[PDB]
Amino acid sequence: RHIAIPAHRGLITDRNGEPLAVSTPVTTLWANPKELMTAKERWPQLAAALGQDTKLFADRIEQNAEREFIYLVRGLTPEQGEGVIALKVPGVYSIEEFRRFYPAGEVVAHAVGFTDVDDRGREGIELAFDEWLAGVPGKRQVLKDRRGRVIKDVQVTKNAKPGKTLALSIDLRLQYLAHRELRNALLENGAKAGSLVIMDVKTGEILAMTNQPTYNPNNRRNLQPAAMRNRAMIDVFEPGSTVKPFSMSAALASGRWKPSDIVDVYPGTLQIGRYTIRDVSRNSRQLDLTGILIKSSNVGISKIAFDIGAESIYSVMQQVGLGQDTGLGFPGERVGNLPNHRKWPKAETATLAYGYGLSVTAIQLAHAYAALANDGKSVPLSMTRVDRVPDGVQVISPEVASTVQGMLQQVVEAQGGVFRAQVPGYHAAGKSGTARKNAYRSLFAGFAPATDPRIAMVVVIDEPSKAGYFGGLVSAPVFSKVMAGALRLMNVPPDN
Ligand SMILES: *[C@@H](O)[C@@H](NC(=O)/C(=N\OCc1cc(=O)c(O)cn1O)c1csc(N)n1)C(C)(C)NOS(=O)(=O)O
Secondary structure: OEEEEOOOOOOEEOOOOOEEEEEEEEEEEEEOHHHHOOOHHHHHHHHHHHOOOHHHHHHHHHHOOOOOOEEEEEEEOHHHHHHHHHOOOOOEEEEEEEEEEOOOHHHHHHHHOOEOOOOOEOOHHHHHOHHHHHOEOEEEEEEEOOOOOEEEEEEEEEOOEOOOOEEEOOOHHHHHHHHHHHHHHHHHHOOOEEEEEEEEOOOOEEEEEEEEOOOOOOOOOOOOHHHHOOHHHHOOEOOHHHHHHHHHHHHHHOOOOOOOOEEEOOOOEEEEOOEEEEOOOOOOOEEEHHHHHHHOOHHHHHHHHHHHOHHHHHHHHHHHOOOOOOOOOOOOOOOOEOOOOOOOOHHHHHHHHOOOOOEEOHHHHHHHHHHHHOOOEEOOOEOEOOOOOOOOEEOOOHHHHHHHHHHHHHHHHOOOOOHHHOOOOOOOEEEEEEEEOOOEEEEEEEEEOOOOOOEEEEEEEEOOOOOOOOHHHHOHHHHHHHHHHHHHHOOOOOOO
């Protein structure tokens, strides 16, 4: 005797108010079979107007002849819905429902996400903020006889309360650029998949989060599972060489190391019992601390790790958020793993230092680079617009963080460095990685402007299927292109 009035779901906008998910009116048709059974001559026209087969439709009504309510179709356009009401079939009733429209479609599919057949969040923000966005359904009183004829909508028991508007931290302008450049990078490199995250180092905001493959959330048929994966938050991977800046932060905080110190890495290998630590380039002897990062020496970083101890390194990585809960509350978001010991064996000490054996998400890696860029201060991650910035936690000392920033600027700008990550007009800083899963993931993590950091970025390219696979070759030019555009879109003054 009482029906549910569906509430208008809260609008999702980007940080500048551009619409990202909009509640659109749709017409749901239901029928009182007992009443339909008195107008059988009308069924074929009704069947056609609903997009059902004549006999299948008549089979469906006959079976439910005793029932007082059945749905005919859900989510017709109010125009298609009018056409059925125009038929004037006895026992046919309509309910005004809501279906989401995603104006930017595939461009921000994984971050915004989508709703199910019931207008409930299923993925991404739609799911995470489902309670805020859903509002509360209405309740009304109706007069119905024995044949089930809806005589009159007597009174409203409770009025439907709409959902609340939500402004994301995402900047659709930076999102379009990140989407486009990641898509082009995947095609050029013949890659299986990719992720790209942009963060505001000062506010903790995620300014862009894109993955490949993507999907159109407006095309509700086919939807391929693999295409719907929000890899940036769900795919865990070994960060490899991109963790070396954190091992270096612990070295500089220990009091035992300064940038001009030297480590002898010759012959480019180091035996630790059954295990052998190996460098890619094996034509070095003495390297200073910056040289260890430029050359990306697994041996160099392992030797520093043995001197300072793995506890100091684990602590920096844990404090920056590697293998830690982001607090974003996205159901199914992976936390990964950061290994821990009471007594760190030599092999585990070395592997921790060069990012082997730990598992992280592109979001955690981006958040960690944000803390280092933000002069050692970690500001809580946010997927919504931050108007009042929360207090950050000083995780790395400002002096150490500033020293590490300078070394990462030399990684990008020095002789033998990652020249493809250079951002024309600006001083950029970062570190490449290559993680053997022969199948690899190409990685680049960095920030800019090196002199006053504003944005951190992580580019992850999964299984590049061309001549070059190293992070410095495959992901570094994507960071370059996306950073050059993002800094200019944010009117960041060039610092070079
Ligand atoms: C840093 O990312 C570092 N990478 C590694 O040491 C890893 N893999 O390497 C690639 C590799 C490994 C092999 O065993 C082999 O036979 C051939 N390869 O090409 C690594 C770390 S964690 C993980 N799962 N794999 C390095 C030295 C390559 N530097 O990265 S970059 O060159 O600065 O990008």
